[PDB]
Protein backbone atom coordinates (compact mmCIF):
# COMPACT_ATOMS: atom_id res chain seq x y z
CA UNK A 1 0.00 0.00 0.00
CA UNK A 2 2.54 2.58 1.16
CA UNK A 3 5.04 1.21 -1.38
CA UNK A 4 5.93 3.21 -4.52
CA UNK A 5 5.36 6.42 -2.53
CA UNK A 6 8.10 6.23 0.10
CA UNK A 7 9.57 9.69 0.84
CA UNK A 8 12.36 8.30 3.01
CA UNK A 9 13.90 6.52 0.01
CA UNK A 10 15.40 9.87 -1.09
CA UNK A 11 17.96 9.72 1.75
CA UNK A 12 19.86 6.50 0.96
CA UNK A 13 23.64 7.03 0.94
CA UNK A 14 24.89 4.84 -1.91
CA UNK A 15 28.49 5.93 -1.29
CA UNK A 16 28.69 4.43 2.22
CA UNK A 17 27.16 1.04 1.31
CA UNK A 18 29.94 -1.58 1.34
CA UNK A 19 28.56 -5.14 1.39
CA UNK A 20 31.92 -6.94 1.15
CA UNK A 21 32.57 -7.82 4.81
CA UNK A 22 30.66 -10.35 6.91
CA UNK A 23 26.86 -10.06 7.03
CA UNK A 24 26.19 -9.69 10.76
CA UNK A 25 24.21 -7.30 12.94
CA UNK A 26 25.63 -4.22 14.64
CA UNK A 27 24.64 -5.06 18.22
CA UNK A 28 23.08 -8.53 17.96
CA UNK A 29 26.17 -10.16 16.39
CA UNK A 30 23.84 -12.76 14.85
CA UNK A 31 23.79 -13.89 11.22
CA UNK A 32 20.04 -14.71 11.23
CA UNK A 33 17.39 -12.28 9.95
CA UNK A 34 19.95 -9.56 9.25
CA UNK A 35 18.81 -6.27 7.73
CA UNK A 36 21.39 -3.69 6.66
CA UNK A 37 20.65 0.03 6.84
CA UNK A 38 20.63 1.99 3.58
CA UNK A 39 21.21 5.29 5.43
CA UNK A 40 23.18 4.46 8.59
CA UNK A 41 25.61 2.30 6.60
CA UNK A 42 25.94 -0.44 9.21
CA UNK A 43 23.90 -3.65 9.35
CA UNK A 44 21.46 -4.57 12.13
CA UNK A 45 19.16 -7.50 12.90
CA UNK A 46 15.40 -7.92 12.80
CA UNK A 47 12.76 -6.44 10.51
CA UNK A 48 10.14 -5.19 12.96
CA UNK A 49 9.35 -3.66 16.31
CA UNK A 50 11.24 -4.78 19.44
CA UNK A 51 14.12 -5.80 17.15
CA UNK A 52 17.53 -4.15 16.89
CA UNK A 53 16.76 -2.76 13.42
CA UNK A 54 13.66 -0.85 14.55
CA UNK A 55 15.50 0.60 17.55
CA UNK A 56 18.47 1.64 15.41
CA UNK A 57 16.13 3.23 12.87
CA UNK A 58 14.14 5.14 15.51
CA UNK A 59 17.22 6.33 17.39
CA UNK A 60 19.42 7.30 14.43
CA UNK A 61 16.54 8.43 12.17
CA UNK A 62 17.90 6.13 9.44
CA UNK A 63 14.51 5.01 8.11
CA UNK A 64 15.53 2.81 5.17
CA UNK A 65 16.74 -0.78 5.59
CA UNK A 66 17.29 -3.68 3.20
CA UNK A 67 17.28 -7.34 4.25
CA UNK A 68 20.51 -9.08 3.27
CA UNK A 69 18.55 -12.31 2.61
CA UNK A 70 15.10 -11.18 1.45
CA UNK A 71 16.69 -8.53 -0.82
CA UNK A 72 13.81 -6.11 -0.22
CA UNK A 73 13.95 -2.43 0.74
CA UNK A 74 11.61 -1.68 3.64
CA UNK A 75 10.99 1.28 5.94
CA UNK A 76 11.93 -0.41 9.21
CA UNK A 77 10.30 2.15 11.59
CA UNK A 78 7.00 1.88 9.69
CA UNK A 79 7.43 -1.80 8.67
CA UNK A 80 6.23 -0.90 5.16
CA UNK A 81 8.22 -2.53 2.36
CA UNK A 82 9.15 -0.01 -0.32
CA UNK A 83 8.90 -0.60 -4.06
CA UNK A 84 11.20 1.44 -6.31
CA UNK A 85 13.04 -0.02 -9.30
CA UNK A 86 15.55 2.85 -9.19
CA UNK A 87 17.10 1.10 -6.16
CA UNK A 88 17.97 -2.04 -8.14
CA UNK A 89 21.61 -0.91 -8.15
CA UNK A 90 21.91 -1.61 -4.41
CA UNK A 91 20.43 -5.09 -4.83
CA UNK A 92 22.69 -5.79 -7.82
CA UNK A 93 25.78 -4.72 -5.86
CA UNK A 94 24.70 -6.80 -2.85
CA UNK A 95 23.79 -9.91 -4.90
CA UNK A 96 25.59 -9.84 -8.27
CA UNK A 97 23.73 -12.25 -10.56
CA UNK A 98 24.98 -12.92 -14.09
CA UNK A 99 22.45 -13.72 -16.80
CA UNK A 100 22.71 -16.84 -18.96
CA UNK A 101 23.97 -14.78 -21.91
CA UNK A 102 25.71 -12.03 -19.92
CA UNK A 103 28.01 -14.72 -18.48
CA UNK A 104 29.24 -15.42 -22.03
CA UNK A 105 29.62 -11.86 -23.37
CA UNK A 106 32.70 -11.24 -21.20
CA UNK A 107 34.79 -11.19 -24.38
CA UNK A 108 32.56 -8.40 -25.74
CA UNK A 109 33.76 -5.87 -23.14
CA UNK A 110 33.83 -2.61 -25.12
CA UNK A 111 32.52 0.17 -22.87
CA UNK A 112 34.34 0.88 -19.62
CA UNK A 113 32.21 0.18 -16.55
CA UNK A 114 32.00 3.36 -14.46
CA UNK A 115 31.42 2.69 -10.77
CA UNK A 116 28.84 4.56 -8.72
CA UNK A 117 31.77 6.60 -7.38
CA UNK A 118 33.80 8.95 -9.57
CA UNK A 119 36.07 6.36 -11.19
CA UNK A 120 35.68 4.63 -14.55
CA UNK A 121 36.93 1.05 -14.62
CA UNK A 122 36.66 -2.27 -16.45
CA UNK A 123 35.21 -5.47 -14.96
CA UNK A 124 37.88 -8.02 -14.08
CA UNK A 125 40.54 -5.31 -13.69
CA UNK A 126 39.77 -4.58 -10.04
CA UNK A 127 42.00 -4.40 -6.97
CA UNK A 128 41.69 -6.46 -3.80
CA UNK A 129 42.61 -4.47 -0.69
CA UNK A 130 45.88 -5.62 0.88
CA UNK A 131 44.68 -6.37 4.39
CA UNK A 132 48.09 -6.70 6.10
CA UNK A 133 50.26 -9.19 4.13
CA UNK A 134 47.52 -10.50 1.84
CA UNK A 135 49.47 -9.67 -1.33
CA UNK A 136 50.18 -13.27 -2.36
CA UNK A 137 46.60 -14.47 -1.89
CA UNK A 138 45.15 -11.34 -3.51
CA UNK A 139 47.41 -11.80 -6.55
CA UNK A 140 46.58 -15.51 -6.83
CA UNK A 141 42.85 -14.77 -6.62
CA UNK A 142 42.97 -11.91 -9.14
CA UNK A 143 44.93 -14.13 -11.54
CA UNK A 144 42.73 -17.23 -11.18
CA UNK A 145 39.64 -15.05 -11.71
CA UNK A 146 41.00 -14.03 -15.13
CA UNK A 147 40.42 -17.49 -16.66
CA UNK A 148 37.00 -17.42 -18.38
CA UNK A 149 36.29 -21.08 -17.42
CA UNK A 150 36.61 -20.52 -13.67
CA UNK A 151 35.00 -17.07 -13.79
CA UNK A 152 31.99 -18.44 -15.68
CA UNK A 153 31.71 -21.44 -13.36
CA UNK A 154 31.78 -19.24 -10.25
CA UNK A 155 29.50 -16.58 -11.77
CA UNK A 156 26.55 -19.02 -11.72
CA UNK A 157 25.56 -19.94 -8.16
CA UNK A 158 23.50 -22.86 -9.49
CA UNK A 159 26.73 -24.56 -10.58
CA UNK A 160 27.77 -25.02 -6.93
CA UNK A 161 24.69 -24.47 -4.73
CA UNK A 162 23.48 -28.06 -5.19
CA UNK A 163 26.87 -29.61 -4.39
CA UNK A 164 26.45 -32.49 -1.93
CA UNK A 165 29.00 -31.55 0.68
CA UNK A 166 29.03 -33.11 4.16
CA UNK A 167 27.03 -31.01 6.64
CA UNK A 168 29.89 -30.80 9.14
CA UNK A 169 32.51 -29.51 6.70
CA UNK A 170 34.18 -26.10 6.69
CA UNK A 171 36.07 -26.51 3.38
CA UNK A 172 32.78 -25.83 1.56
CA UNK A 173 33.22 -22.16 2.52
CA UNK A 174 36.21 -21.90 0.17
CA UNK A 175 34.05 -23.00 -2.77
CA UNK A 176 31.32 -20.63 -1.54
CA UNK A 177 33.40 -17.58 -0.57
CA UNK A 178 35.52 -17.65 -3.74
CA UNK A 179 32.33 -17.58 -5.80
CA UNK A 180 31.18 -14.39 -4.08
CA UNK A 181 34.56 -12.74 -4.70
CA UNK A 182 34.53 -13.79 -8.36
CA UNK A 183 30.99 -12.47 -8.82
CA UNK A 184 31.81 -9.16 -7.12
CA UNK A 185 35.03 -8.69 -9.10
CA UNK A 186 33.04 -9.02 -12.35
CA UNK A 187 30.15 -6.73 -11.39
CA UNK A 188 29.46 -4.32 -14.30
CA UNK A 189 27.78 -1.77 -11.99
CA UNK A 190 29.58 -2.12 -8.67
CA UNK A 191 29.03 0.75 -6.25
CA UNK A 192 32.78 1.04 -5.62
CA UNK A 193 35.74 0.50 -7.95
CA UNK A 194 37.30 -2.32 -5.91
CA UNK A 195 36.31 -5.39 -3.90
CA UNK A 196 37.68 -6.36 -0.50
CA UNK A 197 39.04 -9.93 -0.25
CA UNK A 198 38.40 -9.86 3.50
CA UNK A 199 35.73 -12.57 3.45
CA UNK A 200 37.52 -14.86 0.98
CA UNK A 201 40.91 -14.40 2.65
CA UNK A 202 39.42 -15.04 6.09
CA UNK A 203 37.77 -18.21 4.79
CA UNK A 204 41.08 -19.33 3.26
CA UNK A 205 42.86 -18.69 6.57
CA UNK A 206 40.21 -20.66 8.48
CA UNK A 207 40.18 -23.53 5.96
CA UNK A 208 43.97 -23.99 5.88
CA UNK A 209 44.94 -24.75 9.53
CA UNK A 210 46.84 -21.54 10.34
CA UNK A 211 48.54 -21.65 6.91
CA UNK A 212 48.50 -18.77 4.41
CA UNK A 213 46.92 -16.28 6.80
CA UNK A 214 46.32 -12.59 6.14
CA UNK A 215 48.88 -11.53 8.76
CA UNK A 216 52.09 -13.06 7.36
CA UNK A 217 52.58 -13.31 3.60
CA UNK A 218 53.11 -16.71 2.00
CA UNK A 219 54.50 -18.26 -1.16
CA UNK A 220 52.41 -17.52 -4.23
CA UNK A 221 53.04 -20.93 -5.79
CA UNK A 222 52.16 -22.74 -2.56
CA UNK A 223 49.04 -20.61 -2.10
CA UNK A 224 47.92 -21.27 -5.68
CA UNK A 225 48.50 -25.02 -5.28
CA UNK A 226 46.59 -25.14 -1.99
CA UNK A 227 43.70 -23.10 -3.39
CA UNK A 228 43.49 -25.28 -6.51
CA UNK A 229 43.52 -28.47 -4.43
CA UNK A 230 40.85 -27.09 -2.09
CA UNK A 231 38.66 -26.04 -5.02
CA UNK A 232 39.06 -29.46 -6.66
CA UNK A 233 38.19 -31.25 -3.41
CA UNK A 234 35.28 -28.87 -2.76
CA UNK A 235 33.73 -28.80 -6.23
CA UNK A 236 33.12 -32.55 -6.00
CA UNK A 237 30.45 -33.60 -3.53
CA UNK A 238 29.67 -36.85 -1.70
CA UNK A 239 31.64 -38.83 -4.29
CA UNK A 240 35.08 -39.20 -5.86
CA UNK A 241 34.09 -37.12 -8.89
CA UNK A 242 37.51 -36.12 -10.19
CA UNK A 243 35.92 -34.26 -13.14
CA UNK A 244 35.71 -30.97 -11.27
CA UNK A 245 35.57 -27.59 -13.00
CA UNK A 246 39.07 -26.74 -11.77
CA UNK A 247 40.36 -30.22 -12.63
CA UNK A 248 38.89 -29.91 -16.13
CA UNK A 249 39.96 -26.31 -16.82
CA UNK A 250 43.50 -26.16 -15.38
CA UNK A 251 44.73 -29.76 -14.85
CA UNK A 252 46.45 -31.83 -17.52
CA UNK A 253 48.14 -35.22 -17.90
CA UNK A 254 51.92 -35.70 -17.84
CA UNK A 255 53.61 -39.04 -18.54
CA UNK A 256 56.85 -39.15 -16.55
CA UNK A 257 58.93 -41.85 -18.22
CA UNK A 258 61.17 -41.82 -15.16
CA UNK A 259 64.12 -44.05 -14.30
CA UNK A 260 66.89 -44.38 -11.70
CA UNK A 261 70.66 -44.84 -11.65
CA UNK A 262 72.26 -47.94 -10.08
CA UNK A 263 75.17 -46.43 -8.13
CA UNK A 264 77.94 -43.83 -8.54
CA UNK A 265 80.50 -45.84 -6.55
CA UNK A 266 80.19 -49.19 -8.34
CA UNK A 267 82.21 -50.80 -11.16
CA UNK A 268 80.90 -51.67 -14.62
CA UNK A 269 79.72 -55.16 -13.63
CA UNK A 270 77.81 -54.09 -10.51
CA UNK A 271 76.25 -51.14 -12.35
CA UNK A 272 75.19 -53.28 -15.33
CA UNK A 273 73.72 -55.89 -12.97
CA UNK A 274 71.32 -53.32 -11.51
CA UNK A 275 70.74 -51.83 -14.98
CA UNK A 276 69.56 -55.25 -16.19
CA UNK A 277 67.86 -56.51 -13.00
CA UNK A 278 65.22 -53.72 -13.14
CA UNK A 279 66.99 -51.95 -10.26
CA UNK A 280 67.68 -49.02 -12.62
CA UNK A 281 64.73 -49.49 -14.96
CA UNK A 282 62.65 -46.86 -16.76
CA UNK A 283 58.94 -46.76 -15.91
CA UNK A 284 55.93 -44.68 -16.93
CA UNK A 285 54.25 -43.16 -13.87
CA UNK A 286 51.90 -40.80 -15.74
CA UNK A 287 50.14 -38.44 -13.32
CA UNK A 288 47.98 -35.30 -13.41
CA UNK A 289 50.19 -32.20 -13.65
CA UNK A 290 47.92 -29.38 -12.49
CA UNK A 291 50.95 -27.07 -12.32
CA UNK A 292 54.15 -27.52 -14.35
CA UNK A 293 57.03 -26.28 -12.18
CA UNK A 294 59.33 -25.14 -14.98
CA UNK A 295 62.58 -24.65 -13.06
CA UNK A 296 64.73 -21.70 -14.11
CA UNK A 297 68.52 -22.15 -14.25
CA UNK A 298 70.62 -20.65 -11.48
CA UNK A 299 72.36 -17.38 -12.27
CA UNK A 300 75.98 -17.88 -13.41
CA UNK A 301 77.14 -15.31 -10.81
CA UNK A 302 79.75 -14.06 -13.28
CA UNK A 303 79.85 -11.33 -15.91
CA UNK A 304 80.63 -11.81 -19.60
CA UNK A 305 81.54 -9.80 -22.69
CA UNK A 306 77.92 -9.56 -23.86
CA UNK A 307 74.87 -8.79 -21.67
CA UNK A 308 75.39 -5.10 -20.95
CA UNK A 309 72.74 -5.64 -18.29
CA UNK A 310 74.01 -7.96 -15.58
CA UNK A 311 70.65 -9.74 -15.27
CA UNK A 312 71.02 -13.21 -16.86
CA UNK A 313 68.22 -13.62 -19.38
CA UNK A 314 66.83 -17.01 -20.44
CA UNK A 315 64.47 -18.06 -23.26
CA UNK A 316 61.14 -19.66 -22.39
CA UNK A 317 61.58 -22.42 -24.96
CA UNK A 318 64.83 -23.57 -23.36
CA UNK A 319 63.18 -23.30 -19.93
CA UNK A 320 60.12 -25.35 -20.93
CA UNK A 321 62.16 -27.88 -22.95
CA UNK A 322 63.19 -29.61 -19.72
CA UNK A 323 59.76 -31.25 -19.44
CA UNK A 324 60.21 -32.77 -22.92
CA UNK A 325 60.96 -36.46 -23.29
CA UNK A 326 64.56 -36.04 -24.45
CA UNK A 327 65.62 -33.79 -21.56
CA UNK A 328 66.51 -36.04 -18.63
CA UNK A 329 66.50 -34.73 -15.06
CA UNK A 330 68.23 -36.12 -11.97
CA UNK A 331 66.73 -36.29 -8.48
CA UNK A 332 69.10 -36.57 -5.50
CA UNK A 333 66.98 -39.01 -3.53
CA UNK A 334 68.27 -40.67 -0.37
CA UNK A 335 70.97 -43.23 -1.23
CA UNK A 336 69.99 -43.16 -4.91
CA UNK A 337 70.49 -41.17 -8.10
CA UNK A 338 66.95 -40.82 -9.46
CA UNK A 339 67.69 -39.78 -13.05
CA UNK A 340 64.19 -39.23 -14.46
CA UNK A 341 62.66 -37.79 -17.62
CA UNK A 342 59.22 -36.25 -18.09
CA UNK A 343 56.83 -36.06 -21.04
CA UNK A 344 53.54 -34.16 -21.33
CA UNK A 345 50.89 -36.76 -22.17
CA UNK A 346 47.99 -34.31 -22.41
CA UNK A 347 47.83 -30.51 -22.20
CA UNK A 348 45.10 -28.78 -20.16
CA UNK A 349 42.96 -26.05 -21.76
CA UNK A 350 44.56 -23.43 -19.47
CA UNK A 351 48.09 -24.53 -18.58
CA UNK A 352 49.43 -23.05 -15.34
CA UNK A 353 53.22 -22.76 -15.08
CA UNK A 354 54.94 -21.60 -11.88
CA UNK A 355 58.68 -20.99 -12.23
CA UNK A 356 60.41 -21.70 -8.91
CA UNK A 357 62.50 -18.53 -8.86
CA UNK A 358 63.26 -18.89 -5.13
CA UNK A 359 65.47 -21.58 -3.59
CA UNK A 360 67.27 -22.25 -0.31
CA UNK A 361 71.06 -21.92 -0.11
CA UNK A 362 73.38 -23.67 2.34
CA UNK A 363 72.92 -20.82 4.83
CA UNK A 364 70.03 -18.68 3.48
CA UNK A 365 67.21 -18.63 0.93
CA UNK A 366 68.04 -16.76 -2.28
CA UNK A 367 65.77 -15.83 -5.18
CA UNK A 368 67.05 -16.49 -8.70
CA UNK A 369 66.81 -13.22 -10.68
CA UNK A 370 67.07 -14.84 -14.13
CA UNK A 371 64.51 -13.42 -16.55
CA UNK A 372 62.20 -15.66 -18.57
CA UNK A 373 62.12 -14.42 -22.18
CA UNK A 374 58.60 -15.68 -22.85
CA UNK A 375 56.76 -14.38 -25.94
CA UNK A 376 53.24 -13.44 -24.90
CA UNK A 377 51.56 -13.71 -28.31
CA UNK A 378 51.80 -17.32 -29.54
CA UNK A 379 53.61 -20.47 -28.43
CA UNK A 380 53.26 -24.22 -28.98
CA UNK A 381 54.23 -27.08 -26.67
CA UNK A 382 53.96 -29.67 -29.46
CA UNK A 383 57.76 -29.47 -29.73
CA UNK A 384 57.93 -30.88 -26.17
CA UNK A 385 54.84 -33.13 -26.18
CA UNK A 386 54.87 -36.92 -26.13
CA UNK A 387 55.43 -38.61 -29.48
CA UNK A 388 52.67 -41.17 -28.84
CA UNK A 389 49.75 -38.71 -29.05
CA UNK A 390 51.42 -35.74 -30.77
CA UNK A 391 48.71 -35.58 -33.45
CA UNK A 392 45.89 -36.29 -30.97
CA UNK A 393 46.00 -32.74 -29.56
CA UNK A 394 44.60 -30.72 -32.46
CA UNK A 395 45.18 -27.33 -30.79
CA UNK A 396 48.60 -26.41 -29.42
CA UNK A 397 48.93 -22.63 -30.01
CA UNK A 398 48.84 -21.43 -26.41
CA UNK A 399 49.05 -17.77 -25.38
CA UNK A 400 49.86 -16.41 -21.93
CA UNK A 401 46.79 -14.97 -20.21
CA UNK A 402 48.10 -13.86 -16.81
CA UNK A 403 51.48 -13.47 -15.11
CA UNK A 404 52.11 -12.90 -11.39
CA UNK A 405 55.54 -11.45 -10.59
CA UNK A 406 56.96 -11.29 -7.06
CA UNK A 407 59.27 -8.28 -7.18
CA UNK A 408 61.53 -7.22 -4.33
CA UNK A 409 63.71 -9.02 -1.84
CA UNK A 410 62.67 -12.53 -0.72
CA UNK A 411 61.90 -11.50 2.87
CA UNK A 412 60.34 -8.10 2.08
CA UNK A 413 58.77 -8.54 -1.35
CA UNK A 414 55.79 -7.26 -3.29
CA UNK A 415 53.48 -9.45 -5.38
CA UNK A 416 52.32 -7.77 -8.59
CA UNK A 417 50.08 -9.39 -11.22
CA UNK A 418 50.43 -8.65 -14.94
CA UNK A 419 47.23 -9.94 -16.56
CA UNK A 420 46.26 -9.79 -20.24
CA UNK A 421 42.66 -8.60 -20.23
CA UNK A 422 40.15 -9.96 -22.72
CA UNK A 423 37.67 -7.79 -24.62
CA UNK A 424 40.46 -5.30 -25.24
CA UNK A 425 44.08 -6.27 -25.83
CA UNK A 426 45.88 -4.26 -23.15
CA UNK A 427 47.83 -6.42 -20.69
CA UNK A 428 47.20 -4.39 -17.54
CA UNK A 429 49.46 -4.77 -14.50
CA UNK A 430 47.54 -4.63 -11.22
CA UNK A 431 49.01 -3.80 -7.82
CA UNK A 432 47.22 -4.61 -4.56
CA UNK A 433 44.83 -1.70 -5.12
CA UNK A 434 46.39 0.18 -8.08
CA UNK A 435 45.49 -0.68 -11.68
CA UNK A 436 48.01 0.49 -14.28
CA UNK A 437 48.77 -0.16 -17.94
CA UNK A 438 51.79 -2.31 -18.86
CA UNK A 439 53.35 -2.48 -22.31
CA UNK A 440 53.37 -6.03 -23.75
CA UNK A 441 57.14 -5.87 -24.25
CA UNK A 442 57.52 -4.84 -20.60
CA UNK A 443 55.49 -7.86 -19.46
CA UNK A 444 58.30 -10.17 -20.60
CA UNK A 445 60.80 -7.98 -18.69
CA UNK A 446 59.72 -8.44 -15.06
CA UNK A 447 60.76 -11.78 -13.58
CA UNK A 448 57.56 -13.83 -13.62
CA UNK A 449 56.74 -16.35 -10.89
CA UNK A 450 53.38 -17.94 -11.82
CA UNK A 451 52.00 -17.84 -15.36
CA UNK A 452 48.69 -19.09 -16.77
CA UNK A 453 48.36 -19.54 -20.53
CA UNK A 454 45.25 -20.17 -22.63
CA UNK A 455 45.59 -22.86 -25.29
CA UNK A 456 43.09 -21.10 -27.61
Amino acid sequence: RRSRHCPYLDTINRSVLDFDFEKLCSISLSHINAYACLVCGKYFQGRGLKSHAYIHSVQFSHHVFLNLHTLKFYCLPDNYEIIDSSLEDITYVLKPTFTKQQIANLDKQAKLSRAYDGTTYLPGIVGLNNIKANDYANAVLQALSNVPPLRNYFLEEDNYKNIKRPPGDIMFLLVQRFGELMRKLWNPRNFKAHVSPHEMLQAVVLCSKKTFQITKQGDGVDFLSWFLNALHSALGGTKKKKKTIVTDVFQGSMRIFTKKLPHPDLPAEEKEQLLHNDEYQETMVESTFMYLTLDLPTAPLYKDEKEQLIIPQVPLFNILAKFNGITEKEYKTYKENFLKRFQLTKLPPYLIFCIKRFTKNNFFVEKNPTIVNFPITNVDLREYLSEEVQAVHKNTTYDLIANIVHDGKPSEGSYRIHVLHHGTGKWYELQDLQVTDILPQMITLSEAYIQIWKRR
Partner: protein, 64 residues
Protein backbone atom coordinates in the same frame (compact mmCIF):
# COMPACT_ATOMS: atom_id res chain seq x y z
CA UNK B 1 75.90 -32.26 4.22
CA UNK B 2 79.55 -32.97 4.93
CA UNK B 3 82.06 -30.66 3.30
CA UNK B 4 83.26 -33.77 1.53
CA UNK B 5 79.72 -34.63 0.51
CA UNK B 6 79.36 -31.10 -0.79
CA UNK B 7 82.07 -31.54 -3.41
CA UNK B 8 81.51 -35.31 -3.67
CA UNK B 9 79.37 -35.05 -6.81
CA UNK B 10 81.90 -32.73 -8.46
CA UNK B 11 84.87 -34.83 -7.30
CA UNK B 12 83.29 -37.95 -8.82
CA UNK B 13 82.96 -36.34 -12.26
CA UNK B 14 86.24 -34.42 -11.88
CA UNK B 15 88.21 -37.64 -12.48
CA UNK B 16 87.03 -37.60 -16.12
CA UNK B 17 89.68 -35.01 -17.04
CA UNK B 18 92.33 -36.62 -19.23
CA UNK B 19 96.09 -36.44 -18.67
CA UNK B 20 96.41 -33.68 -21.27
CA UNK B 21 93.51 -31.88 -19.57
CA UNK B 22 95.15 -32.47 -16.17
CA UNK B 23 98.48 -31.09 -17.46
CA UNK B 24 97.42 -28.06 -19.55
CA UNK B 25 96.06 -26.23 -16.48
CA UNK B 26 97.69 -22.78 -16.78
CA UNK B 27 99.20 -20.84 -13.92
CA UNK B 28 96.68 -18.45 -12.38
CA UNK B 29 99.07 -15.53 -12.87
CA UNK B 30 98.00 -15.09 -16.50
CA UNK B 31 65.99 -14.21 -30.55
CA UNK B 32 68.27 -12.84 -27.85
CA UNK B 33 67.13 -10.56 -25.03
CA UNK B 34 68.25 -6.91 -25.26
CA UNK B 35 67.48 -5.74 -21.73
CA UNK B 36 68.93 -2.25 -22.20
CA UNK B 37 66.91 -1.70 -25.40
CA UNK B 38 63.54 -1.29 -23.68
CA UNK B 39 65.09 0.96 -21.04
CA UNK B 40 66.70 3.17 -23.68
CA UNK B 41 63.42 3.37 -25.61
CA UNK B 42 61.49 4.33 -22.48
CA UNK B 43 64.09 6.94 -21.53
CA UNK B 44 63.99 8.43 -25.03
CA UNK B 45 60.19 8.57 -24.98
CA UNK B 46 60.19 10.23 -21.55
CA UNK B 47 62.82 12.76 -22.64
CA UNK B 48 60.85 13.57 -25.80
CA UNK B 49 57.64 14.05 -23.80
CA UNK B 50 59.41 16.27 -21.26
CA UNK B 51 61.03 18.35 -24.02
CA UNK B 52 57.60 18.78 -25.60
CA UNK B 53 56.43 19.95 -22.18
CA UNK B 54 59.66 21.93 -21.78
CA UNK B 55 59.05 23.58 -25.17
CA UNK B 56 56.15 25.44 -23.51
CA UNK B 57 58.44 27.17 -20.98
CA UNK B 58 58.45 30.98 -20.90
CA UNK B 59 61.91 32.32 -20.11
CA UNK B 60 64.40 29.47 -19.78
CA UNK B 61 67.83 30.98 -20.45
CA UNK B 62 70.74 29.47 -22.37
CA UNK B 63 74.38 30.59 -22.49
CA UNK B 64 76.06 29.38 -25.66
Amino acid sequence: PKIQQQFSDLKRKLAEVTEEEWLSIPEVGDGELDMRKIGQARNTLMDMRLSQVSDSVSGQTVVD
